[PDB]
Structures are given as structure tokens and as C-alpha cells.
Amino acid sequence: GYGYYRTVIFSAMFGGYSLYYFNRKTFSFVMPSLVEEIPLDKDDLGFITSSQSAAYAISKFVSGVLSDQMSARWLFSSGLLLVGLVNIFFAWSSTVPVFAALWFLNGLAQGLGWPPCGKVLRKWFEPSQFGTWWAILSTSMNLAGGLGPILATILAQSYSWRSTLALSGALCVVVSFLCLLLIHNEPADVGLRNESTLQELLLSPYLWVLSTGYLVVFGVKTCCTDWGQFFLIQEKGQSALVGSSYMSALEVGGLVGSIAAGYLSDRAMAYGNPRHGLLLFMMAGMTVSMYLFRVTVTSDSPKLWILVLGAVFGFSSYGPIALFGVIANESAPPNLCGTSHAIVGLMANVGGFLAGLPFSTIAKHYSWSTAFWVAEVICAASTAAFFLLRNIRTKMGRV
Numbered sequence: 256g257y258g259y260y261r262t263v264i265f266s267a268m269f270g271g272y273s274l275y276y277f278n279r280k281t282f283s284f285v286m287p288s289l290v291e292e293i294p295l296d297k298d299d300l301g302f303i304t305s306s307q308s309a310a311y312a313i314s315k316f317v318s319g320v321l322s323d324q325m326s327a328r329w330l331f332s333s334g335l336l337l338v339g340l341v342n343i344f345f346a347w348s349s350t351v352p353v354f355a356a357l358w359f360l361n362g363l364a365q366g367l368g369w370p371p372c373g374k375v376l377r378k379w380f381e382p383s384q385f386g387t388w389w390a391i392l393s394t395s396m397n398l399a400g401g402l403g404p405i406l407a408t409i410l411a412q413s414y415s416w417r418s419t420l421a422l423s424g425a426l427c428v429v430v431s432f433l434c435l436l437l438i439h440n441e442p443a444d445v446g447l448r449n450e451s452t453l454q455e456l457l458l459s460p461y462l463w464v465l466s467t468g469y470l471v472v473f474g475v476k477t478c479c480t481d482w483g484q485f486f487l488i489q490e491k492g493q494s495a496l497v498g499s500s501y502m503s504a505l506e507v508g509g510l511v512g513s514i515a516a517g518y519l520s521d522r523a524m525a526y527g528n529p530r531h532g533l534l535l536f537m538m539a540g541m542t543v544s545m546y547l548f549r550v551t552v553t554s555d556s557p558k559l560w561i562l563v564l565g566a567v568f569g570f571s572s573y574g575p576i577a578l579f580g581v582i583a584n585e586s587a588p589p590n591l592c593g594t595s596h597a598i599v600g601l602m603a604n605v606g607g608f609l610a611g612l613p614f615s616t617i618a619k620h621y622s623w624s625t626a627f628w629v630a631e632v633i634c635a636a637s638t639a640a641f642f643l644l645r646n647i648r649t650k651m652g653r654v
């Protein structure tokens with residue numbers, strides 16, 4: 256029965272997480288213009304991305320493991336300020352080692368944003384709305400990623416990427432203070448108030464199936480998101496604007512996938528779970544759309560086909576992520592939640608890392624088309640393996 260605190264703190268969290276994701280992907284968008292200005296090869300960008308992904312994986316694992324020695328409001332503000340500062344210092348730089356270092360510091364700082372977001376969510380809300388509130392808050396990433404790719408490309412006509420990065424850093428710095436002044440860790444303003452072992456958890460042959468299902472989906476999604484603009488600009492003849500709009504159309508369907516995965520899971524169709532069929536259909540759609548994008552798209556093709564393929568791929572790729580997040584927590588052994596998700600998140604992050612330097616060097620050796628061929632083959636093999644392996648124990652922890 257509290258008022259206006261829920262609104263203020265929720266808006267603050269939305270803004271903060273939007274800025275985090277916008278900074279990471281603002282490097283992602285300025286990559287082509289940086290390549291045009293600074294003559295970077297095909298394997299330095301992958302090196303930078305891989306370094307950032309590894310740093311983010313380590314930071315996220317550490318922050319998930321240690322989530323008690325914090326105030327949940329100083330950590331958030333410090334992370335936002337550090338991200339803004341590293342972006343500002345990234346704006347004024349030329350060489351490759353500096354880029355890699357200043358982006359391994361950004362990836363390290365990026366791990367302190369999400370873990371403290373739940374420490375206020377669990378305390379400011381009744382436990383009957385946390386499930387939907389998590390899903391509502393998770394769309395900030397899609398909102399931030401569906402606006403940047405087109406905005407930066409359409410603004411770079413008269414202003415260089417340096418101005419964009421500097422302004423993004425300044426905005427992050429200011430919103431750091433604006434969010435430190437508003438977020439409340441726990442309700443204390445006027446006065447408000449409310450067997451199992453690791454051996455038996457790692458040995459269950461379902462955690463690794465879920466984990467590899469996630470190292471494959473996340474790696475494929477990250478590789479496609481990061482290199483679709485380059486695949487469109489080079490090889491097949493399309494302008495830079497069409498390539499940028501592919502990413503924005505990818506996140507437009509991603510928002511629908513995350514917010515409708517839960518709706519389609521429990522309803523309609525209802526060991527195993529009554530979501531494997533939907534998950535397999537989503538994976539098959541992700542493979543078919545990626546194959547069609549690789550083959551059908553040519554120099555002469557209406558942009559509507561490209562946008563439709565991007566939206567379909569986004570919908571087919573952002574659904575399994577939410578499905579995995581739900582299923583891992585639901586099938587986790589009792590009193591082992593959180594630590595049953597840290598491993599899954601760590602392997603998803605390492606799969607995202609695998610789509611950096613190795614993908615870049617595969618493309619550099621032969622072509623982009625071969626790299627996407629390998630990605631499609633991997634996805635198809637994983638889908639077939641999932642389809643063959645359904646009746647396995649999903650009650651890990653004790654039997």
C-alpha cells in the first residue's frame with residue numbers, strides 16, 4: 256500500500272538498464288563508421304568483441320555469486336558512471352590495443368547492472384507480481400537495441416561517431432547522479448514493511464543439455480546481430496542504411512518474442528515439459544530464416560523481404576532465451592536457485608564470446624558466407640539433437 260515509490264524506482268531502473276544496453280550496442284553501431292574511417296581488418300573487431308564478452312562473463316559470474324555485500328544503489332550508480340566514463344574515453348582513441356583495453360573495462364563494468372536490479376524488485380513488490388515485472392523490465396534491452404542502429408546511422412550524415420559516443424557518455428554520467436538521487440534500496444522513507452549437493456546437481460544429464468542449447472542459441476544470435484550489417488554492406492550489394500535497418504527490425508520482433516513466450520507456454524499445449532515442442536519450433540524457424548537470409552537475399556531484392564527475415568529471426572531467437580530462463584529456474588532443485596542459473600548464464604556468455612574472434616577469423620580466411628554456413632550447420636545439428644533427446648530426467652537434484 257505504498258504510492259509513487261514503485262513508479263519512481265521502476266522508471267529509474269528502466270532508464271538505467273536502457274543506457275547500459277545502449278552504450279554496449281552503441282559501440283556495436285559505430286563499428287561500420289569506425290571501419291570506414293580507421294582501416295581496421297576483419298579480425299581486430301572480433302578481438303575487441305571477444306575481450307568484452309569474456310570480461311562481461313567473468314563480471315556477471317562474480318556479481319551473481321556475491322550479491323549480499325552491496326547497497327543495491329551505489330553499485331548501480333557506480334556501474335553507470337564507469338560505463339559513461341569508458342565510453343567518453345573510447346571516443347578519443349585511435350589504436351587497437353587502447354580500444355581492446357577500454358572495452359575490457361566496459362565489459363567488466365557491465366556486470367554490475369543486472370544483479371542489483373533484483374535486490375530492489377524482490378523487496379518493493381509482492382511475490383505475486385515479480386514474475387510479470389521481470390518480463391516487463393526485460394524489454395528495456397530490446398527498446399534500447401531497436402532504436403540505436405537506425406538513429407546513429409541516420410545521424411552520422413553530418414556528425415561523426417566521436418560526437419555520438421561523447422554525448423552518450425555524458426548522458427550516462429548525468430543519469431548516474433539522477434538515478435542515485437532517486438533509487439531506494441529498501442523501504443525506509445516513512446516506514447514500510449512486508450539431500451541436496453553440488454555433486455547431485457552437476458551429474459544430472461539435463462543441465463548440460465540446457466546449457467549447450469544456450470551456448471548455441473546465444474552465440475548464433477550474437478554473431479547474426481553483430482555481423483549482419485557487414486554481410487549486407489559487403490558481398491551482396493546493399494547500402495549502409497539497409498544494413499542498419501536490419502538490426503532494428505531484428506529487435507522489433509525480439510520484443511514480441513520475449514513478451515509472448517510466457518503466453519504461449521502454459522496455455523494451449525500442456526520426463527519432459529510442455530514447452531519442448533514450442534522451443535523446437537522456434538529453433539527450426541530460426542534455422543529456416545537464417546538459411547533463407549543466406550541464400551535468397553541478393554543484390555537486387557526489395558528491402559521488405561530483408562526486414563521480414565530479420566523480424567522473423569528476432570522472434571525465433573528471443574523466444575528460446577526467455578523459455579530457457581523460465582525452465583532453468585522452474586526445474587532447478589530446491590534451495591539451489593540462483594546457483595542453478597549462474598552456470599547457465601556463464602555458458603551463455605561464453606557462447607556469445609565464441610561468436611567474436613573465431614567467427615571473425617573464419618570470415619577473414621574464406622568469407623562471411625562460409626561463416627554463416629557454419630553457423631547454420633551448427634544450429635541445425637543442435638536442433639536435431641534436441642529433437643532426438645526429449646525423454647530425459649528434468650527433476651535434477653534428488654530422485
Ligand SMILES: O=P(O)(O)OC[C@H]1O[C@@H](O)[C@H](O)[C@@H](O)[C@@H]1O
Pocket residue numbers: 315369393576577580
Ligand atoms: O544477457 P544479459 O546481458 O545478461 O541480460 C540479463 C538478462 O537477459 C535476459 O535475456 C535473460 O533472460 C535474463 O535471465 C538475464 O538476466
